[PDB]
Paper text:
GBS strains express either one of two SRR proteins, Srr1 or Srr2. Like other MSCRAMMs, Srr1-BR and Srr2-BR contain two domains, termed N2 and N3, with each adopting the DE variation of the Ig fold.
To assess whether Srr1 and Srr2 could support a DLL mechanism of ligand binding, we determined the crystal structures of S. agalactiae Srr1-BR and Srr2-BR at resolutions of 1.65 and 3.65 Å, respectively. An unusual feature of the Srr2-BR structure, not observed in Srr1-BR or in any previous structures of MSCRAMMs, is the conformation of the C terminus of the N3 domain. In contrast to other structurally characterized DLL proteins, the latch region in S. agalactiae Srr2-BR adopted a distinct conformation in the absence of ligand. Examination of the structures of the S. agalactiae Srr1 and Srr2 binding regions suggests how Srr2 might have greater affinity for the host ligand. In Srr2, the C-terminal latch of N3 appears to be pre-ordered in a conformation that might best be called “open, but ajar” that is poised to close over host ligand quickly. Although the cysteine cross-linking studies suggest that both Srr1 and Srr2 C termini are able to close even in the absence of ligand, the pre-ordered conformation of the C terminus in Srr2 would almost certainly require less time to do so. This would theoretically increase the kon and reduce the koff, and it could be numerically reflected as improved ligand affinity. To reveal whether the latch domain of Srr2-BR was important for binding, we generated a variant of the protein (Srr2-BRΔlatch), in which the terminal 13 residues of this domain were deleted. Removing the C-terminal amino acids of the Srr2 binding region abolished fibrinogen binding.
Author numbering: 230 to 545
């Protein structure tokens, strides 16, 4: 009665994948944010309370970089009912569903899942040609090859070849926090400008809900060679300069940094920022003069105004 794993006890199970939501077929771009799509139907006799089943995922499929386990939409009855809750574990990269009472009470129980997955920005660090994505279960599996790109930085042949890129990586929706990483001097070029060079992080639209006011910025220093497209890497193994360039929890409500007149060929900076967050946000980082007359910037929005994470009810 206590419950147990029942993946064996599964019939007519058909699982698949695809894209569609992607810019242009055969390619998945983060700086834009597209996804995969697990088609999954199945039938079963009877199941008790705790009974569960896995969905083995490849070492590169992520559901939500946030935390170390994300809850995924449950399976439902034709009449939208609690049928089986789901939960993705980042360490064992597999999704798990634990049935409920409804599941026990019935016999001709048929379930279906249309879950949208993404590539993992921690493993698929840089850009790839035809990556392999696979979702497995009992006997049936589900392959699909897609490319994985990250829009280039932004550059103007000014002050030597000023370059910048940025991106919202994790979005702790529950706790309401984001991680807005940014890279300075991506191309990695020796760049100078009398009157100085600066970097400023701020929310771009009158109605962003960043609240940098209560954010935590942390800066690391490195070399363009060993840096990633996704910006998600092992920072300890690189110099921490935060303390000397800027302090977290800025009163102004935006960070501004004076790098000085020169940034060396090798000198590149990773700026991780963790802020609060509300309905929607869109913010950028710059690399310009005290004015932004001459400079460069990179924005990255998120909205999802009142959505679109928990998209209850969806059929295609």
């Amino acid at each position: 009665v206590q419950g147990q794993d029942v993946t064996d006890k599964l019939q007519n199970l058909d699982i698949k994948l695809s894209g569609g939501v992607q810019a242009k077929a055969g390619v998945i771009n983060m700086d834009k944010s597209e996804s995969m799509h697990m088609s999954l139907k199945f039938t079963i006799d009877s199941v008790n309370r705790g009974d569960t089943f896995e969905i083995k995922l490849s070492d590169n499929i992520d559901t939500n970089g946030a935390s170390n386990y994300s809850i995924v939409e449950p399976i439902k009855s034709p009449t939208g009912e609690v049928y089986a809750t789901g939960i993705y574990d980042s360490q064992k990269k597999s999704i798990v569903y634990s049935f409920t009472d409804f599941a026990a009470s019935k016999n001709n129980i048929n379930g279906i899942l249309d879950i949208p997955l993404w590539p993992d920005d921690t493993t698929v660090q840089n850009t790839k040609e035809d990556v392999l994505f696979s979702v497995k279960i009992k006997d049936q599996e589900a392959t699909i090859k897609e490319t994985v790109k990250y829009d280039p930085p932004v550059r103007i042949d000014f002050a030597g070849g000023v370059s910048v890129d940025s991106r919202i990586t994790n979005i702790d929706d529950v706790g309401k926090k984001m991680t807005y990483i940014s890279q300075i001097n991506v191309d990695g070029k020796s760049l100078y400008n009398y009157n100085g060079l600066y970097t400023r992080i701020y929310n771009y639209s009158k109605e962003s809900t960043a609240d940098l006011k209560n954010s935590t910025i942390k800066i690391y220093k490195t070399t363009s060679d060993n840096i990633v497209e996704s910006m998600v890497q092992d920072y300890s193994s690189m110099e921490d300069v935060t303390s000397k360039f800027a302090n977290s929890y800025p009163e102004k409500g935006w960070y501004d940094i004076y790098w000085g007149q020169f940034i060396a060929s090798n000198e590149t900076y990773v700026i991780v920022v963790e802020t609060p967050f509300t309905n929607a946000v869109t913010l950028n980082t710059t690399l310009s003069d005290y004015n932004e007359n001459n400079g460069v910037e990179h924005n990255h929005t998120y909205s999802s105004e009142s959505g679109y994470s928990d998209v209850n009810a969806q059929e295609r």
